[PDB]
Amino acid sequence: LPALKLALEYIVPCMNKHGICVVDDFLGKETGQQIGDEVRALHDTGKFTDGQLVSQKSDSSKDIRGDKITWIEGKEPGCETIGLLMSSMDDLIRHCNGKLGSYKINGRTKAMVACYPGNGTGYVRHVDNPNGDGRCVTCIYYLNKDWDAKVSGGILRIFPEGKAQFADIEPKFDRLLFFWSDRRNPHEVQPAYATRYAITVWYFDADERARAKVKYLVRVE
């Protein structure tokens, strides 16, 4: 799909109605696999952090750590396909501007590449931007081939506001997900029992970000 067709025929109407939108087979197998290879290279060469401290025990030798991250600009050697993903995300958002709510997106974060190492850790229920920091849309790309949650866990569970039933999303290879970053979309990552990779960028609303600068006295493109 041309980015503009995906944007106009799906992302815009989907976001305005549900605020959570899934695009499968975003970039295709070849490109997805090359992204996977770049992320695994980052992992194998020690570019991720050691992981979120989950359980801090009296003895530090068996401390439990969870999600590992690394921040990627997209131009680094060995990260050019990641950069290409980011550009593709940006192109989609561009074609959506003026149509995602009343927001006006004028920048984004660098990419946060996350690895849940497969040791039964997940991520607690949270809101990405609960305090008005400028971020209006979360965009995440999943890289996990033949991921089977029945077996490997790692489901994203989102709980929209005032709705009784949550939504479970598998972190499937070449899946792109958009959702509003604010309190409309509390979510969590259920425990993962296999290595689980994803890449997130957050898009900023111009007005919210401009006045966040005041109240809190890292944005590109």
Ligand X SMILES: C[C@H](NC(=O)c1nc(Cl)c2ccccc2c1O)C(=O)O
Extract the annotated binding site for 2-oxoglutarate: 196
Question: Binding residue for ligand X (CB under 6 A) from 7, 48, 96, 128?
Answer: 128
- The one of ligand X, Fe ion, none whose footprint includes residue 82, by CB under 5 to 8 A per kind, is none
Write out the binding residues for Fe cation: 126, 128, 187
Q: How many residues does the chain have?
A: 221
- The one of ligand X, Fe ion, none whose footprint includes residue 140, by CB under 5 to 8 A per kind, is ligand X
Question: Binding residue for ligand X (CB under 6 A) from 7, 39, 72, 189?
Answer: 189
Q: How far apart are CA 16 and CA 99, in angstroms?
A: 8
Minimum CB distance to ligand X, residue 181 (Å): 9
The one-letter amino acid code at 199 reads: I
Minimum CB distance to Fe ion, residue 171 (Å): 12
Residue 89 binds ligand X, judged by CB under 6 A: no
Burial degree of 49 (CB within 10 A; 0-12, 13-18, 19+): middle
The nearer residue to ligand X, 128 or 182, going by C-beta atoms, is: 128
Nearest partner of 111 among 58, 26, 176, judged by Cα: 176
3-state secondary structure 142-192: ECECCCCHHHHECCEEECCCCCCCCEEECCECCEEEEEECCCCCCEEEEEE
Judged by the rule CB under 5 A, the positions of this chain that interact with Fe ion are 128
Judged by the rule CB under 6 A, the positions of this chain that interact with ligand X are 67, 69, 114, 123, 126, 128, 140, 156, 171, 187, 189, 198
